[PDB]
């Protein structure tokens, strides 16, 4: 069975002017880390990088066996723009965090107030 999977992603970076300007990517996979896919992507446009606090996306997906999806693993390389040179990090790609649908995950950044969260849900496509 194929599923509509809806990802709700929230970006956080403590620093007073409206929302953050995340660039990079976030990817998911079910059980095989080589079968990962982007759920969000934004190229580094520095000062032109879009403001984004929440991002929503629906994707069609299935498992190895077509069975229901019980598990999803996420990671990200997500940054904020070099006010001077050195970028804020909201997520490092070495960190993978998985959950069942209905549980949200957090990817941690280089400070307690820089991070990303991802929530997902599924309905038969």
């Amino acid at each position: 069975t194929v599923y509509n999977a809806t990802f709700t992603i929230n970006f956080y970076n403590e620093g007073e002017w409206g929302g953050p300007e995340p660039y990079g990517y976030i990817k998911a996979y079910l059980t095989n880390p080589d079968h990962d896919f982007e759920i969000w992507k934004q190229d580094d446009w520095g000062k032109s990088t879009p403001e984004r606090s929440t991002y929503t996306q629906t994707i069609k997906i299935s498992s190895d066996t077509g069975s229901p999806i019980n598990q999803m693993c996420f990671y990200g390389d997500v940054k904020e723009y070099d006010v001077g040179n050195a970028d804020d990090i909201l997520a490092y790609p070495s960190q993978k965090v998985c959950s069942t649908p209905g549980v949200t995950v957090r990817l941690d950044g280089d400070e307690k107030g820089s991070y990303v969260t991802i929530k997902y849900s599924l309905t038969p496509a």
Binding site: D34, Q95, K96, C98, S99, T100, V103, R106, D108
Partner: protein
């Protein structure tokens, strides 16, 4: 705040009779009953959150499978808070120990929490305590493969308004005085008071019964469960190549948590 029945009888007596000094006494018929603290909802609408704490990596660079034990420990400090924010003071103690079972929307975990509501105060009570999560599991690492075992703590937070309610029947005996003399000696229902002043969270429900409808909250944040999340990935020397896989092993549930 707290509606003081006596003070409001005091005010009634002064307004109605012109008394300048008032003395009331609860009649032995006076009763409080059907005490009930109820949560306004029971499904926390905020999802639990998986946080990764540390990881333990084990490289099996040899040609045979190995068994490896990975063990984790974590000490979480966590909080519960309750209070009545709109209450009532009658002549006798009014309080309730209430237990609540909360679920989380879109999932399957249940938490149990209890608090004592004293209807007569707005004082807030908080407990902060530590909990030591400890978990371990024995993994088989195929040859030429490494494993990353990440320790995950699943956090939940809740802030739930509760209804703080009871019924009251019976009367106060009230003495009003003016200019050195007693000018009134009457009985006044709490229903009568509710008819007199509709701004006291009391309503006349008929048959002489007044209903009190006040409010408060139960709020908290705790670890709900630990998970060991295991990823196997081929080492460079693999060649044939082990198949990368992530699987999850249940660690522990919190004591007050069930499914």
């Amino acid at each position: 705040g707290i509606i003081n029945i006596q003070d409001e009888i005091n005010n009634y007596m002064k307004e109605v009779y012109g008394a300048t000094t008032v003395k009331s006494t609860y009649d032995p018929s006076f009763k409080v009953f059907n005490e009930s603290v109820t949560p306004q909802f029971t499904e926390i609408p905020t999802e639990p959150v998986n946080n990764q704490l540390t990881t333990k990596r084990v490289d099996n660079t040899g040609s045979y499978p190995v068994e490896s034990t990975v063990s984790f420990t974590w000490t979480e400090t966590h909080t519960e808070t309750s209070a009545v924010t709109e209450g009532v003071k009658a002549g006798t103690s009014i309080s309730t120990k209430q237990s609540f079972k909360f679920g989380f929307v879109n999932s399957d975990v249940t938490l149990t929490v209890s608090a004592e509501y004293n209807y007569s105060t707005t004082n807030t009570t908080t407990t902060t305590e530590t909990h030591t999560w400890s978990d371990s599991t024995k993994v088989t690492i195929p040859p030429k493969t490494y494993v990353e075992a990440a320790y995950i703590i699943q956090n939940g937070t809740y802030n739930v308004p509760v209804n703080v309610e009871c019924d009251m029947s019976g009367t106060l005996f009230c003495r009003g005085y003016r200019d050195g003399a007693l000018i009134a000696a009457v009985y006044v229902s709490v229903a009568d008071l509710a008819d007199y002043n509709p701004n006291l969270n009391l309503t006349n429900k008929g048959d002489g019964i007044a209903h009190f409808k006040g409010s408060g909250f139960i709020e908290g944040a705790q670890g709900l469960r630990s998970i060991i999340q295991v990823t196997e990935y081929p080492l460079d020397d693999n060649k044939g190549r082990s198949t990368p896989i992530t699987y999850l092993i249940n660690g522990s549930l919190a004591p007050n948590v069930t499914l």
